[PDB]
Amino acid sequence: NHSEQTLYQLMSERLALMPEVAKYKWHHNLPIEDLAREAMVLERTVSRTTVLDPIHTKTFFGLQMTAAKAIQANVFQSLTNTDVVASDVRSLNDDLRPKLTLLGDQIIEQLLISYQNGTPLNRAHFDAHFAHFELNPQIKDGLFKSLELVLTPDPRDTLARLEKDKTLRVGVTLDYEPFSYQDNEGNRAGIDIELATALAKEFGYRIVWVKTSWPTLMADAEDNLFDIALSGISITAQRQHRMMFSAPYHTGGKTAIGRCSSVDELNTLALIDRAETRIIVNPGGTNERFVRSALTNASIRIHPDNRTIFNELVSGTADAMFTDSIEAQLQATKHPSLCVLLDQPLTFQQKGILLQPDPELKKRIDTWLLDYLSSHDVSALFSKHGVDPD
């Protein structure tokens, strides 16, 4: 598959110039991050990728920039002592950035080609291609994940209906927390309950709360049981083939949680994926897909109810669960006996609102959400629900 290998090669070419960018910046005592350059590159790209989703394209380009900076910081570390041979430094503006701008545009052509042909991405080819880069797994995962979303495209008249009846049917799971759940008073609570309410208020809508779940989520969506759904729903490619997504409202990735008393025997992916480790997981969502793809040796227990699954780690019946880092960090605080077992997340994942596939609904919801993330303290809402703002 020419198209895919060509796209991966052009991305590695971009990353391969970055030691040279770092030598220049080291020599001139310049920071790694140049935000003005970043914005110029991002705006050029979105204006040349209009047929692609702009949020996905910016995430994909942003992650290449994040990969580029990590590489540059690898080099900065090297250059303590060593130093740049000052006679070797290559011009950032005359030499290096024109080349990056050119690669930029070639990457764009190839995205357009892959999109049009419906290039089926192979995660195994990506990995083989990028394995040699000194880049942490989250960055490498984001590179592939956002690329895949950029490359996936039967709509509904959801907005038309809503503008008549003003009745926003909002699908919730009530098993996640901090996103959606019940207090021990019984009432719906979460980041997503409040998000959904603020969205209703500002559109002039009333909410019917429809109960869904991870195993029936997409089935419930295809049957048109809700109009949107919020419950810390991961934005994935598979979901986006059938449904739509808002702008992302949280960025993270999967980590491990287990008992503090076990952490030395479990603080590595290698140490966790052994025969003797018992993995517990909730059915039907990104937790399940992850551990099915990520693990070869560990036996996996399905635990149907996500509100009670952490009790199995506490009690000793399972050893580790892979889940969203924001969940792991909340449960590590709720339960003193538990700790997050890994240094850093293994994956890249964002939370977005699931939408029925109506592009006008998406435009309007995206406009509001991004306004909201600008204009209201999102930090304090997360925090209000037990999320340490870090």
Q: Which does 330 bind (CB under 5 to 8 A by kind): ligand TSA, Cl ion, none?
A: none
Pick the closer one to ligand TSA by CB: 31 or 389.
Answer: 31
Element holding 29 (H helix, E strand): none
Q: Which does 171 bind (CB under 5 to 8 A by kind): ligand TSA, Cl ion, none?
A: none
Pick the closer one to ligand TSA by CB: 70 or 340.
Answer: 70
Q: Where are the alpha helices (DSSP H) in 87-245?
A: 97-117, 123-130, 137-150, 158-165, 191-203, 217-222, 237-242
Q: Which does 100 bind (CB under 5 to 8 A by kind): Cl ion, ligand TSA, none?
A: ligand TSA
| Contact assessment for residue 297 and residue 274, using Cβ atoms and an 8 Å cutoff | yes
Would you call 252 helix, strand, or coil by DSSP?
A: strand
Site for Cl ion contains 234 (CB under 5 A) = yes
Provide the β-strand partners of residue 299: 278
- Cis omega before residue 178 (within 30°)? yes
Q: Which residue is nearest to Cl ion (CB)?
A: 252
- Which residues of this chain interact with ligand TSA, rule CB under 6 A? 21, 33-34, 37-38, 41, 64-65, 68-69, 72, 97, 100
Planar angle of CA 112, 34, 90, nearest 5 degrees: 85
Quote the least distance from Cβ 34 to ligand TSA, whole Å: 4
47 CB neighbour count, 10 Å cutoff: 9
Q: Which of residues 294-333 bind Cl ion (CB under 5 A)?
A: 324-326
How far separated are the first and last CA of the chain, in Å rounded? 41
Quote the least distance from Cβ 64 to ligand TSA, whole Å: 6
Q: Which does 324 bind (CB under 5 to 8 A by kind): Cl ion, ligand TSA, none?
A: Cl ion
Alpha-carbon Rg for the chain in angstroms: 22
User: Can you say whether residue 186 is alpha, beta or left, with left for phi > 0 and alpha for psi between -120 and 50 degrees?
Assistant: left
Quote the least distance from Cβ 16 to ligand TSA, whole Å: 12
CA 388 to chain centre: 19
Q: Which of residues 246-275 bind Cl ion (CB under 5 A)?
A: 252
Q: Which does 285 bind (CB under 5 to 8 A by kind): ligand TSA, Cl ion, none?
A: Cl ion
Quote the least distance from Cβ 229 to Cl ion, whole Å: 11
Q: Which does 33 bind (CB under 5 to 8 A by kind): ligand TSA, Cl ion, none?
A: ligand TSA
Residues making contact with Cl ion (CB under 5 A): 234, 252, 285-286, 324-326
